[PDB]
Amino acid sequence: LHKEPATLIKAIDGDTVKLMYKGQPMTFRLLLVDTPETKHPKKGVEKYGPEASAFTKKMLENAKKIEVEFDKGQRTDKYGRGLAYLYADGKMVNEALVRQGLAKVAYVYKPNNTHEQHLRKSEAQAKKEKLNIWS
């Protein structure tokens, strides 16, 4: 797997962000994690939804460099969103969210599951620390 550079356009919510990637504007969905939503008509703002979005936004807005990491499977979902691991100054946004109790590890789908163990360890620790979603 290899990291590629990208530029923040807009953070949309905790797990969806609009980037500039290879000269084009593109929406990315964070691989392997599910944050609570602030969007949905049936839903509204779920618990920790706003927390999760502000975390993603701040982390990316304050970075010196952002990189995207594609996994080994398909790279776009049925909605046209890129599927990736996002890094802010070398720190994986996807893991940070999970380590802080702001996201659950998603239903995983082979072969897009390279960082699955890693995230699952941070999730267990977050649960143990009873953080946010785990409180």
From Swiss-Prot:
Subcellular location: Secreted
Native organism taxonomy: Bacteria, Bacillati, Bacillota, Bacilli, Bacillales
Residues of the full protein shown: 89 to 223 of 231
Residues that coordinate or bind Ca(2+): 15, 34-35
Region Disordered: start-end pairs: 115-135
Active site location: 29, 37, 81
Name this protein carries in UniProt: Nuclease A
Biased composition (Basic and acidic residues): 115-131
Protein source organism: Staphylococcus aureus
Coiled coil location: none
